[PDB]
Structures are given as C-alpha cells and as structure tokens.
C-alpha cells in the first residue's frame, strides 16, 4: 500500500571528562565559553 | 492500508563529569557559560 | 507499491578526555572558545 | 532669526514573513536568537 | 539668519520571506544566530 | 547667511528571499550565522 | 613549624570615564553590551 | 620548616577615558560589544 | 628546608584614551567588536 514519510533521527549523548583534579585556587581570570557532549 | 508520517525523534542523555576535585578557593574570577549533557 | 522518503541521519557522541590534572593554579590568562564533542 | 537644532528621526517597520507552514511537529531540537523586524 | 545644525537620519525597513514552507518536521538540529531586516 | 552642516544619511532596507521551499526534514546539522537585509 | 596554603587574591577597581556629554537627544538607536570597570 | 605553595594573584584596574564630548545625537546606529578596564 | 612552589602572576591596568572628541551625530553605521584595557 502506499507508505508516508516516517519520522527519525533521535539524538544519543554519553561523555566523560575530568575538570581541574588536584590545582591550587589561586587568583584564576575568567574561563567561559566551555562546553561538551552537545550543541549550542 | 494507507500509512500517515509517525512522529520519532526520543532524545536521551547520560553524563559523568569531575569538576574541582582537589583545589585551594582562593579568589577566583568569574567562570560563566559553563554547560554540559544537553543543548542551549 | 508506493514508498515515499523515509526520514532519518540519527546522531551519537561519546568522547572522553582529560582536562587540568596536575598543575599548580597561579594567575592563569582567560581560556575560551573551548568545545569538544558536538559542533556549534 | 536664531533657529536652534531640532530633534527627529522618527522609526517606522513593517514586515511580512511566513514560518513553518506545512510541516510535521516531531521531536525538533530548540531553535532560537530567531527575531525580525526590528533591532536587539 | 543663523541656522542650527538639524537632528535627521530616519530609519524604514520593509522585507518579506518565506521560512520552512514544505517540510517534514523530523529531529532538526539547533539552528540559531538567525535575524533579518534589521540590525543586532 | 552662516549655514551650520546638516545632519542626514537616512537608511532604507527591502528584500525578498525564499528560505527551505520544498524540502523533507530530516536530521539537518545547526545551520547560525544566516543573516540579511542590513548589517550587524 | 608547617606552613599551610594561604587564601588571598584581593580584587581593587577604581575607573573615571565621560559618557555622553554635550549632544542632542534626537532617535538615538539601541546601545547595549556597554560595560566598564569590571567582568561580566 | 616545610612551606606549602601560597595562594596569590592580586588584581588592580583604574582607566580613564572619553566617549561622545562634542557630537549631535542625530538618528544613530545601534553600538554594542563596547568595553574596557577589565575582561569578558 | 623544602620549599614548594608559590603561585604570582598578579595583573596591573591602566590605559588613558579619547574617542569621539569633536564630531557631528549623523546617521553613523553601528561599530562593534570595539575593546582596549585588557582581554577578551
């Protein structure tokens, strides 16, 4: 029989990163703009 | 039979992130726009 | 019989890296435009 | 005689846009920074 | 007489376009950063 | 008699585009930095 | 005797600027994103 | 005696600057991402 | 004795400039991206 468009494309995110472990806290500037494991 | 488009499209999401671990808090500056595990 | 477009091109991510293990923490400069593991 | 600066420049806007008309609502990532017609 | 410098520069702004007219709604990505007639 | 400068240079924007007519929606990238009809 | 780590990293701002002084108050546009004397 | 590393890192802004002494305020643009003495 | 390693690298500003002094108004375009005094 006649079959439509069907709907997809889901999304699947799974990272793992490590950030600052062993650092001293000193007088650090500014960081920004960081981002991971997806979009925008 | 005649078939309409099906909606799809589940997202899921599963992270694991370390961030500061080990560190003195001196005074830091101003961290920002920080994001993980997702979009916007 | 009749078979339209069928939707797809499903995503996936799963990196994994280190950032910051061991170092001191002094007046570090303003770290940016930082991303991995996504576009935009 | 003295005539004295006078204030003006009047805004006038006026647009006419077409969004999403004939399309299916599956599961759309987040769209966004979308304006028109006008500034900010 | 003396004549005073003058206040003028008005602004006028007048499009029209058509966005996503036929098309399936599947998982579309993030699209941003978008913006016509006019400025910012 | 003495004529102090004038102030002008007035703006006027207008277009027409067509923006994704007849197109199936899949799983498109993030498509950003899209912009006309003026400047910024 | 041992000596721990000790806190410090004392921020000082002290500016002095001139905004806007003498001009007309006509349609001015949309100033944004102005910011001095600081982060963030 | 043993002496562990000592937070530190001091920051000191002080700027002075001028912005629109003498200028009319005809119908002007819109200006943005301006700043100074300082980050981000 | 032992002596670990001590965090410094402490910021100093100080920037002194003139912008838009003796000009007219007019229907300037829109300036951006316009910084000095420091980073990012």
């Known amino acids: 029989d006649a079959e439509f468009r069907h709907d997809s494309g889901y999304e ?9 472990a062993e650092d001293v ?7 920004i703009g960081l981002m991971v494991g997806g979009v925008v």
Request: net charge positive; no cysteine.
């Open 12 to 20: 699947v995110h799974h990272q793992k990163l490590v950030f600052f």
């Open 25 to 31: 806290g000193s007088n650090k500037g500014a960081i």
